[PDB]
């Protein structure tokens, strides 16, 4: 029973503070990917949420937005969001197209 707003650029180091970033680079993942934001919540099945506006509709990289449970927390929530999200990006680094499906 807690709600906190999270952004795609908020946990992105590639974007500047004006661009929409407000998280410490020490725990910020560049190129906010749905896989890191959504896959982290999938681990608990309930904690984060991501919804894109109908305006852009379809699938586009124009930017998205996510909402996570917590409420009362600020960057600390973002630090924790990066804690789970950083794993997913970190998981992508461990595996690559060569070792993703068929080995060569």
Short mmCIF file of N, CA, C and O in Angstrom, two decimals:
data_model
loop_
_atom_site.label_atom_id
_atom_site.label_comp_id
_atom_site.label_asym_id
_atom_site.label_seq_id
_atom_site.Cartn_x
_atom_site.Cartn_y
_atom_site.Cartn_z
N UNK A 1 0.85 -1.22 0.00
CA UNK A 1 0.00 0.00 0.00
C UNK A 1 0.87 1.26 0.00
O UNK A 1 0.81 2.07 0.90
N UNK A 2 1.68 1.43 -1.01
CA UNK A 2 2.54 2.64 -1.08
C UNK A 2 2.75 3.01 -2.55
O UNK A 2 2.78 2.15 -3.40
N UNK A 3 2.88 4.27 -2.86
CA UNK A 3 3.07 4.64 -4.29
C UNK A 3 4.19 5.67 -4.44
O UNK A 3 4.28 6.64 -3.71
N UNK A 4 5.03 5.48 -5.42
CA UNK A 4 6.13 6.45 -5.66
C UNK A 4 6.32 6.63 -7.17
O UNK A 4 6.23 5.67 -7.92
N UNK A 5 6.54 7.82 -7.63
CA UNK A 5 6.69 8.02 -9.10
C UNK A 5 8.14 7.84 -9.52
O UNK A 5 9.06 8.34 -8.90
N UNK A 6 8.33 7.13 -10.60
CA UNK A 6 9.69 6.89 -11.12
C UNK A 6 9.70 7.21 -12.61
O UNK A 6 8.71 7.07 -13.30
N UNK A 7 10.80 7.67 -13.13
CA UNK A 7 10.83 8.01 -14.58
C UNK A 7 11.84 7.17 -15.35
O UNK A 7 12.75 6.58 -14.81
N UNK A 8 11.70 7.19 -16.64
CA UNK A 8 12.67 6.46 -17.51
C UNK A 8 14.00 7.23 -17.51
O UNK A 8 15.06 6.66 -17.42
N UNK A 9 13.93 8.53 -17.61
CA UNK A 9 15.17 9.36 -17.62
C UNK A 9 15.70 9.52 -16.19
O UNK A 9 16.89 9.68 -15.97
N UNK A 10 14.83 9.49 -15.23
CA UNK A 10 15.26 9.64 -13.81
C UNK A 10 16.38 8.65 -13.50
O UNK A 10 17.38 9.00 -12.91
N UNK A 11 16.22 7.41 -13.88
CA UNK A 11 17.29 6.42 -13.61
C UNK A 11 18.18 6.29 -14.84
O UNK A 11 18.68 5.23 -15.16
N UNK A 12 18.40 7.37 -15.53
CA UNK A 12 19.27 7.32 -16.74
C UNK A 12 20.41 8.33 -16.62
O UNK A 12 20.19 9.51 -16.43
N UNK A 13 21.63 7.89 -16.73
CA UNK A 13 22.78 8.82 -16.63
C UNK A 13 22.99 9.54 -17.97
O UNK A 13 23.53 10.63 -18.03
N UNK A 14 22.56 8.93 -19.04
CA UNK A 14 22.73 9.56 -20.39
C UNK A 14 21.98 10.89 -20.46
O UNK A 14 22.37 11.80 -21.18
N UNK A 15 20.90 11.02 -19.75
CA UNK A 15 20.11 12.28 -19.79
C UNK A 15 20.66 13.27 -18.76
O UNK A 15 21.18 12.89 -17.73
N UNK A 16 20.56 14.54 -19.03
CA UNK A 16 21.08 15.56 -18.07
C UNK A 16 20.03 15.86 -17.00
O UNK A 16 18.89 15.43 -17.10
N UNK A 17 20.38 16.59 -15.98
CA UNK A 17 19.39 16.91 -14.91
C UNK A 17 18.16 17.59 -15.53
O UNK A 17 17.03 17.26 -15.21
N UNK A 18 18.37 18.52 -16.42
CA UNK A 18 17.21 19.20 -17.07
C UNK A 18 16.46 18.19 -17.95
O UNK A 18 15.25 18.20 -18.04
N UNK A 19 17.19 17.33 -18.59
CA UNK A 19 16.55 16.31 -19.47
C UNK A 19 15.53 15.50 -18.68
O UNK A 19 14.58 14.97 -19.22
N UNK A 20 15.71 15.42 -17.39
CA UNK A 20 14.75 14.65 -16.55
C UNK A 20 15.50 13.66 -15.65
O UNK A 20 14.96 12.64 -15.25
N UNK A 21 16.73 13.94 -15.31
CA UNK A 21 17.49 13.00 -14.43
C UNK A 21 17.63 13.60 -13.04
O UNK A 21 17.78 14.80 -12.87
N UNK A 22 17.58 12.78 -12.03
CA UNK A 22 17.71 13.30 -10.64
C UNK A 22 18.23 12.19 -9.74
O UNK A 22 17.93 12.14 -8.56
N UNK A 23 18.99 11.28 -10.28
CA UNK A 23 19.52 10.16 -9.47
C UNK A 23 21.06 10.21 -9.45
O UNK A 23 21.67 10.63 -10.41
N UNK A 24 21.63 9.76 -8.36
CA UNK A 24 23.11 9.74 -8.24
C UNK A 24 23.72 8.80 -9.27
O UNK A 24 23.36 7.65 -9.39
N UNK A 25 24.65 9.30 -10.03
CA UNK A 25 25.32 8.48 -11.09
C UNK A 25 25.92 7.20 -10.50
O UNK A 25 26.08 6.21 -11.19
N UNK A 26 26.26 7.22 -9.24
CA UNK A 26 26.88 6.00 -8.63
C UNK A 26 25.95 4.80 -8.78
O UNK A 26 26.39 3.68 -8.95
N UNK A 27 24.66 5.01 -8.75
CA UNK A 27 23.72 3.87 -8.91
C UNK A 27 22.72 4.17 -10.04
O UNK A 27 21.57 3.81 -9.97
N UNK A 28 23.16 4.84 -11.07
CA UNK A 28 22.22 5.15 -12.19
C UNK A 28 22.55 4.32 -13.44
O UNK A 28 23.69 4.16 -13.81
N UNK A 29 21.54 3.78 -14.09
CA UNK A 29 21.79 2.96 -15.31
C UNK A 29 21.50 3.80 -16.57
O UNK A 29 20.40 4.26 -16.76
N UNK A 30 22.51 3.96 -17.40
CA UNK A 30 22.34 4.76 -18.64
C UNK A 30 21.40 4.04 -19.61
O UNK A 30 21.32 2.83 -19.62
N UNK A 31 20.69 4.77 -20.43
CA UNK A 31 19.76 4.12 -21.40
C UNK A 31 18.68 3.33 -20.65
O UNK A 31 18.67 2.12 -20.64
N UNK A 32 17.80 4.02 -19.98
CA UNK A 32 16.75 3.31 -19.19
C UNK A 32 15.99 2.35 -20.11
O UNK A 32 15.30 2.76 -21.02
N UNK A 33 16.14 1.07 -19.89
CA UNK A 33 15.46 0.07 -20.76
C UNK A 33 14.26 -0.55 -20.05
O UNK A 33 14.29 -0.80 -18.86
N UNK A 34 13.21 -0.81 -20.77
CA UNK A 34 12.02 -1.44 -20.13
C UNK A 34 12.43 -2.75 -19.46
O UNK A 34 11.94 -3.11 -18.41
N UNK A 35 13.32 -3.46 -20.08
CA UNK A 35 13.78 -4.75 -19.51
C UNK A 35 14.30 -4.58 -18.08
O UNK A 35 13.99 -5.36 -17.22
N UNK A 36 15.08 -3.56 -17.81
CA UNK A 36 15.58 -3.38 -16.41
C UNK A 36 14.46 -2.89 -15.50
O UNK A 36 14.30 -3.33 -14.38
N UNK A 37 13.68 -1.97 -15.97
CA UNK A 37 12.57 -1.43 -15.14
C UNK A 37 11.48 -2.49 -14.91
O UNK A 37 11.08 -2.75 -13.80
N UNK A 38 10.99 -3.09 -15.96
CA UNK A 38 9.92 -4.12 -15.80
C UNK A 38 10.44 -5.43 -15.21
O UNK A 38 9.87 -5.97 -14.29
N UNK A 39 11.51 -5.96 -15.74
CA UNK A 39 12.04 -7.27 -15.21
C UNK A 39 12.32 -7.21 -13.70
O UNK A 39 12.18 -8.20 -13.01
N UNK A 40 12.70 -6.08 -13.18
CA UNK A 40 12.96 -6.01 -11.71
C UNK A 40 11.66 -6.25 -10.94
O UNK A 40 11.62 -6.99 -9.98
N UNK A 41 10.60 -5.64 -11.37
CA UNK A 41 9.29 -5.83 -10.69
C UNK A 41 8.82 -7.27 -10.88
O UNK A 41 8.21 -7.86 -10.00
N UNK A 42 9.09 -7.84 -12.02
CA UNK A 42 8.66 -9.24 -12.27
C UNK A 42 9.22 -10.15 -11.18
O UNK A 42 8.60 -11.11 -10.77
N UNK A 43 10.40 -9.85 -10.70
CA UNK A 43 11.00 -10.68 -9.63
C UNK A 43 10.07 -10.73 -8.41
O UNK A 43 9.91 -11.75 -7.77
N UNK A 44 9.44 -9.63 -8.10
CA UNK A 44 8.51 -9.60 -6.93
C UNK A 44 7.05 -9.63 -7.39
O UNK A 44 6.14 -9.79 -6.60
N UNK A 45 6.81 -9.48 -8.67
CA UNK A 45 5.41 -9.52 -9.19
C UNK A 45 4.60 -8.31 -8.69
O UNK A 45 3.42 -8.21 -8.95
N UNK A 46 5.21 -7.40 -7.97
CA UNK A 46 4.46 -6.22 -7.46
C UNK A 46 5.42 -5.29 -6.73
O UNK A 46 5.93 -5.62 -5.68
N UNK A 47 5.65 -4.11 -7.26
CA UNK A 47 6.57 -3.13 -6.61
C UNK A 47 6.78 -1.95 -7.56
O UNK A 47 6.83 -0.81 -7.15
N UNK A 48 6.90 -2.24 -8.82
CA UNK A 48 7.11 -1.17 -9.83
C UNK A 48 6.02 -1.26 -10.92
O UNK A 48 5.38 -2.28 -11.09
N UNK A 49 5.81 -0.20 -11.65
CA UNK A 49 4.77 -0.21 -12.71
C UNK A 49 5.21 0.71 -13.84
O UNK A 49 5.76 1.76 -13.60
N UNK A 50 4.97 0.34 -15.06
CA UNK A 50 5.37 1.24 -16.17
C UNK A 50 4.23 1.41 -17.17
O UNK A 50 3.65 0.45 -17.63
N UNK A 51 3.89 2.63 -17.50
CA UNK A 51 2.78 2.84 -18.47
C UNK A 51 3.12 3.97 -19.44
O UNK A 51 3.51 5.06 -19.05
N UNK A 52 2.99 3.73 -20.72
CA UNK A 52 3.32 4.78 -21.73
C UNK A 52 2.04 5.53 -22.13
O UNK A 52 0.97 4.96 -22.22
N UNK A 53 2.14 6.81 -22.36
CA UNK A 53 0.94 7.60 -22.75
C UNK A 53 0.39 7.13 -24.11
O UNK A 53 1.13 6.67 -24.96
N UNK A 54 -0.89 7.25 -24.31
CA UNK A 54 -1.50 6.82 -25.60
C UNK A 54 -1.03 7.72 -26.75
O UNK A 54 -0.99 7.29 -27.89
N UNK A 55 -0.70 8.95 -26.47
CA UNK A 55 -0.26 9.88 -27.57
C UNK A 55 0.75 9.20 -28.50
O UNK A 55 0.49 9.04 -29.68
N UNK A 56 1.87 8.80 -27.96
CA UNK A 56 2.91 8.13 -28.78
C UNK A 56 2.44 6.74 -29.23
O UNK A 56 2.82 6.27 -30.28
N UNK A 57 1.62 6.10 -28.43
CA UNK A 57 1.10 4.73 -28.75
C UNK A 57 2.18 3.85 -29.41
O UNK A 57 3.34 4.18 -29.40
N UNK A 58 1.78 2.73 -29.97
CA UNK A 58 2.77 1.81 -30.62
C UNK A 58 4.04 1.67 -29.78
O UNK A 58 4.07 2.01 -28.61
N UNK A 59 5.10 1.17 -30.36
CA UNK A 59 6.37 1.02 -29.60
C UNK A 59 7.38 2.07 -30.07
O UNK A 59 7.80 2.07 -31.21
N UNK A 60 7.78 2.97 -29.20
CA UNK A 60 8.75 4.02 -29.62
C UNK A 60 9.73 4.34 -28.48
O UNK A 60 9.44 4.10 -27.32
N UNK A 61 10.87 4.88 -28.80
CA UNK A 61 11.87 5.23 -27.75
C UNK A 61 11.73 6.70 -27.35
O UNK A 61 12.67 7.32 -26.89
N UNK A 62 10.56 7.27 -27.53
CA UNK A 62 10.37 8.70 -27.17
C UNK A 62 10.44 8.90 -25.65
O UNK A 62 10.49 10.01 -25.16
N UNK A 63 10.47 7.83 -24.89
CA UNK A 63 10.56 7.98 -23.41
C UNK A 63 9.32 7.38 -22.75
O UNK A 63 8.24 7.38 -23.31
N UNK A 64 9.46 6.87 -21.55
CA UNK A 64 8.29 6.28 -20.84
C UNK A 64 8.26 6.77 -19.39
O UNK A 64 8.98 7.68 -19.03
N UNK A 65 7.46 6.16 -18.56
CA UNK A 65 7.41 6.58 -17.13
C UNK A 65 7.01 5.39 -16.25
O UNK A 65 6.20 4.57 -16.66
N UNK A 66 7.54 5.27 -15.07
CA UNK A 66 7.15 4.11 -14.21
C UNK A 66 6.75 4.55 -12.79
O UNK A 66 7.22 5.54 -12.27
N UNK A 67 5.90 3.79 -12.15
CA UNK A 67 5.46 4.12 -10.76
C UNK A 67 5.81 2.95 -9.84
O UNK A 67 5.51 1.81 -10.14
N UNK A 68 6.46 3.20 -8.74
CA UNK A 68 6.86 2.07 -7.85
C UNK A 68 6.33 2.24 -6.43
O UNK A 68 6.20 3.34 -5.92
N UNK A 69 6.05 1.15 -5.78
CA UNK A 69 5.55 1.21 -4.38
C UNK A 69 6.69 1.64 -3.46
O UNK A 69 7.84 1.33 -3.71
N UNK A 70 6.36 2.35 -2.41
CA UNK A 70 7.36 2.85 -1.40
C UNK A 70 6.75 4.05 -0.68
O UNK A 70 6.38 3.97 0.47
N UNK A 71 6.59 5.13 -1.39
CA UNK A 71 5.95 6.35 -0.79
C UNK A 71 6.73 6.85 0.43
O UNK A 71 7.02 6.11 1.35
N UNK A 72 7.06 8.11 0.45
CA UNK A 72 7.82 8.67 1.60
C UNK A 72 9.31 8.73 1.26
O UNK A 72 10.06 9.50 1.83
N UNK A 73 9.75 7.91 0.35
CA UNK A 73 11.19 7.92 -0.03
C UNK A 73 11.43 8.81 -1.26
O UNK A 73 10.51 9.12 -2.00
N UNK A 74 12.65 9.21 -1.47
CA UNK A 74 12.96 10.08 -2.65
C UNK A 74 14.08 9.42 -3.48
O UNK A 74 13.90 8.36 -4.04
N UNK A 75 15.25 10.01 -3.54
CA UNK A 75 16.36 9.37 -4.31
C UNK A 75 16.62 7.99 -3.72
O UNK A 75 16.92 7.05 -4.43
N UNK A 76 16.52 7.85 -2.43
CA UNK A 76 16.76 6.52 -1.81
C UNK A 76 15.92 5.47 -2.53
O UNK A 76 16.40 4.40 -2.84
N UNK A 77 14.69 5.78 -2.85
CA UNK A 77 13.88 4.81 -3.62
C UNK A 77 14.57 4.58 -4.95
O UNK A 77 14.71 3.47 -5.42
N UNK A 78 15.01 5.64 -5.57
CA UNK A 78 15.70 5.51 -6.87
C UNK A 78 16.96 4.67 -6.68
O UNK A 78 17.27 3.81 -7.47
N UNK A 79 17.67 4.90 -5.61
CA UNK A 79 18.89 4.08 -5.37
C UNK A 79 18.45 2.61 -5.32
O UNK A 79 19.03 1.75 -5.96
N UNK A 80 17.41 2.32 -4.58
CA UNK A 80 16.91 0.92 -4.52
C UNK A 80 16.38 0.49 -5.89
O UNK A 80 16.65 -0.59 -6.35
N UNK A 81 15.65 1.34 -6.58
CA UNK A 81 15.16 0.94 -7.93
C UNK A 81 16.37 0.58 -8.80
O UNK A 81 16.38 -0.41 -9.50
N UNK A 82 17.41 1.35 -8.71
CA UNK A 82 18.64 1.04 -9.47
C UNK A 82 19.24 -0.26 -8.93
O UNK A 82 19.85 -1.03 -9.64
N UNK A 83 19.04 -0.50 -7.67
CA UNK A 83 19.59 -1.76 -7.07
C UNK A 83 19.05 -2.96 -7.85
O UNK A 83 19.80 -3.80 -8.29
N UNK A 84 17.76 -3.03 -8.05
CA UNK A 84 17.19 -4.16 -8.85
C UNK A 84 17.43 -3.94 -10.35
O UNK A 84 17.85 -4.83 -11.06
N UNK A 85 17.15 -2.76 -10.83
CA UNK A 85 17.34 -2.47 -12.28
C UNK A 85 18.82 -2.66 -12.68
O UNK A 85 19.12 -3.18 -13.73
N UNK A 86 19.72 -2.26 -11.84
CA UNK A 86 21.17 -2.42 -12.17
C UNK A 86 21.48 -3.89 -12.38
O UNK A 86 22.34 -4.23 -13.17
N UNK A 87 20.78 -4.77 -11.72
CA UNK A 87 21.06 -6.20 -11.96
C UNK A 87 20.68 -6.49 -13.41
O UNK A 87 21.45 -7.04 -14.16
N UNK A 88 19.46 -6.19 -13.76
CA UNK A 88 19.02 -6.55 -15.15
C UNK A 88 20.04 -6.00 -16.16
O UNK A 88 20.57 -6.76 -16.95
N UNK A 89 20.36 -4.73 -16.16
CA UNK A 89 21.39 -4.25 -17.14
C UNK A 89 22.66 -5.08 -16.93
O UNK A 89 23.30 -5.54 -17.85
N UNK A 90 22.99 -5.27 -15.69
CA UNK A 90 24.19 -6.08 -15.33
C UNK A 90 24.03 -7.50 -15.89
O UNK A 90 24.99 -8.14 -16.26
N UNK A 91 22.82 -8.00 -15.96
CA UNK A 91 22.62 -9.36 -16.52
C UNK A 91 22.86 -9.33 -18.03
O UNK A 91 23.41 -10.26 -18.61
N UNK A 92 22.47 -8.27 -18.67
CA UNK A 92 22.67 -8.16 -20.14
C UNK A 92 24.17 -8.17 -20.45
O UNK A 92 24.60 -8.75 -21.43
N UNK A 93 24.97 -7.55 -19.63
CA UNK A 93 26.44 -7.54 -19.88
C UNK A 93 27.02 -8.95 -19.78
O UNK A 93 27.86 -9.34 -20.56
N UNK A 94 26.59 -9.71 -18.81
CA UNK A 94 27.13 -11.09 -18.64
C UNK A 94 26.87 -11.95 -19.88
O UNK A 94 27.67 -12.78 -20.25
N UNK A 95 25.75 -11.76 -20.53
CA UNK A 95 25.45 -12.58 -21.74
C UNK A 95 25.43 -11.70 -22.99
O UNK A 95 25.07 -10.55 -22.94
N UNK A 96 25.82 -12.24 -24.11
CA UNK A 96 25.81 -11.43 -25.36
C UNK A 96 25.18 -12.23 -26.50
O UNK A 96 24.95 -13.42 -26.37
N UNK A 97 24.88 -11.60 -27.60
CA UNK A 97 24.25 -12.34 -28.74
C UNK A 97 25.01 -13.64 -29.03
O UNK A 97 24.41 -14.66 -29.34
N UNK A 98 26.30 -13.64 -28.92
CA UNK A 98 27.08 -14.89 -29.18
C UNK A 98 26.67 -15.98 -28.19
O UNK A 98 26.48 -17.12 -28.55
N UNK A 99 26.54 -15.63 -26.94
CA UNK A 99 26.14 -16.65 -25.92
C UNK A 99 24.66 -16.51 -25.55
O UNK A 99 24.18 -17.13 -24.63
N UNK A 100 23.93 -15.68 -26.26
CA UNK A 100 22.49 -15.49 -25.93
C UNK A 100 21.68 -16.73 -26.31
O UNK A 100 21.01 -17.32 -25.49
N UNK A 101 21.73 -17.14 -27.55
CA UNK A 101 20.96 -18.34 -27.97
C UNK A 101 21.89 -19.46 -28.45
O UNK A 101 22.13 -20.43 -27.75
N UNK A 102 22.43 -19.33 -29.63
CA UNK A 102 23.34 -20.39 -30.16
C UNK A 102 24.80 -20.03 -29.87
O UNK A 102 25.20 -18.89 -29.99
N UNK A 103 25.59 -20.99 -29.48
CA UNK A 103 27.02 -20.71 -29.18
C UNK A 103 27.86 -20.81 -30.45
O UNK A 103 27.65 -21.68 -31.27
N UNK A 104 28.81 -19.93 -30.62
CA UNK A 104 29.67 -19.98 -31.84
C UNK A 104 31.15 -19.96 -31.45
O UNK A 104 31.46 -19.36 -30.44
#
